[PDB]
């Protein structure tokens with residue numbers, strides 16, 4: 001007997017984006033006591049959001065999902081699955097996805113957590129699109145969520161002003177025309193230490209009164225890697241999608257650093273009038289949540305329009321990257 | 331307007347191989363605590379604990395090496411790796427890129443997938459989806475677990491349950507369909523049933539308080555798994571277009587033998603159907619459990635390559651993932 005195969009939608013796209021940004025604004029001056037100029041010129045950040053003590057990666061993911069569902073004209077009963085992508089869910093288990101599903105009033109739906117630094121969103125988008133086309137699901141939530149503030153060593157003058165909190169979710173479903181291109185992804189596992197938790201939780205657990213773990217970043221190494229490698233990645237994603245650089249309306253790189261992204265814009269040879277995501281300005285670097293948060297900001301302000309041709313490039317920890325061409329959601 | 335390319339990959343995908351790593355240190359029921367007490371309740375006789383210098387990532391690498399060797403492939407033939415685990419003790423970097431680098435394939439795509447014990451089913455399905463979509467042609471999927479450091483040796487409810495190990499599968503194009511449609515789901519309202527009890531940040535901010543351990547509400551998990559997974563198994567067979575009487579091999583997650591005995595009966599397979607019992611000397615290795623159980627069956631010869639197998643993963647998050655597959659190697 002032959003094992004049967006399911007089939008799903010051919011054309012898949014981003015139906016909606018929904019964003020949750022924590023209430024507390026932390027300015028450059030507040031976090032660093034000419035600090036405002038210093039931080040802004042190096043990173044592009046003016047302010048960022050910090051989540052409250054009672055908030056978590058999962059709780060922000062839930063709020064983002066509620067908003068994404070609303071923008072898609074859907075309820076939780078329309079969703080067949082949810083992928084949470086995060087690096088700041090602070091339990092080995094349970095995973096965030098089932099908790100999020102439950103809070104949404106759809107406790108039974110499939111889901112898992114996906115971790116790949118701030119390439120997680122691209123990987124999760126690709127996985128959702130592949131699952132829907134394979135018939136494993138019809139409509140899915142993909143939410144990038146991050147609570148980075150508790151992981152920051154406020155004495156680490158190399159990164160303390162970089163990381164921030166927030167969540168944003170997209171609805172992926174069948175569309176009239178193809179809305180999501182092939183995923184272009186890869187790694188550099190040899191540079192795994194470039195962005196890291198410096199002390200693993202178990203070594204820490206054997207001596208909790210000694211130094212605790214914090215996020216560490218080898219800035220120059222990441223700058224060099226991102227600025228010199230992601231251009232070729234962007235071109236691969238566009239080639240796979242069958243589009244030219246000059247057909248790109250919107251560029252949404254991961255909001256790691258403005259200077260990096262300015263160099264990527266140049267390398268990718270986009271139109272003079274191409275819209276470039278700059279959400280980092282009042283959001284900072286929110287890792288897995290960055291791209292969908294950046295997408296929401298562009299749509300919220302009317303800088304981008306739904307249906308606009310967008311190039312997304314996620315780069316960051318593990319040294320991991322994931323990129324794809326999409327049409328902008330509602 | 332501008333077209334976004336519509337693409338496809340190979341429709342027929344299957345398991346080309348399985349490879350297993352288990353650590354050297356055998357910990358008997360007698361040592362850990364007695365033998366009859368644990369055995370009666372779990373079906374566990376012994377389990378393997380990893381050495382201090384081992385990790386989920388290191389065991390996953392070694393399981394991947396063996397998997398590649400058994401498929402007659404090298405690292406250069408692989409387009410990416412999915413690592414599924416619950417015991418990679420870093421928020422970042424993820425295990426997959428490190429595993430890829432250790433295999434001499436630092437550049438390949440990959441990521442970590444967490445869904446408790448059902449991680450392997452989700453990861454398997456995702457790799458199959460990605461290959462059929464044309465995003466990759468050949469993949470490694472590896473379940474890995476170093477659970478021993480997470481055990482509270484004073485917790486008389488679970489200290490004898492969890493163990494260490496890793497197993498990987500090579501997934502790629504096969505002449506006939508080798509991986510059935512994914513059947514998966516959750517119960518997020520019972521998320522507290524299997525859990526880390528104190529989150530890492532709360533612990534870090536309060537080092538004078540207690541440290542985190544794995545906790546298990548046994549009865550709640552038992553009742554959910556024993557009585558709900560039968561229907562899951564039926565759906566996966568239905569999706570694969572196969573009948574219960576056609577299943578050659580049954581591989582439930584090796585959570586508890588007594589749960590699995592009840593599952594066997596509920597599923598109404600042939601009397602001569604082969605049931606995975608790797609828990610006896612491997613214990614419960616969470617995400618690594620199913621591929622380890624597949625490797626054990628092939629190693630003893632109880633299962634043969636090509637045999638029709640039903641895999642059911644169930645556990646934390648309250649999460650489940652199941653599919654019918656043809657046995658590898």
Ligand SMILES: *C(=O)OCCCCCCCCCC
Pocket residue numbers: 087088117118151195196197198213214215256285287288315316317421422
């Ligand atoms: C994205 O820019 O990559 C950064 C990944 C953020 C995860 C940081 C992990 C913090 C753990 C330290 C306790």
Ligand SMILES: *C(=O)OCCCCCCCCCC
Pocket residue numbers: 092093416417446447448480524525526527542543544545585616617644645646
């Ligand atoms: C299968 O039974 O799913 C169980 C998931 C493994 C539990 C590990 C999390 C405990 C960490 C405690 C520090």
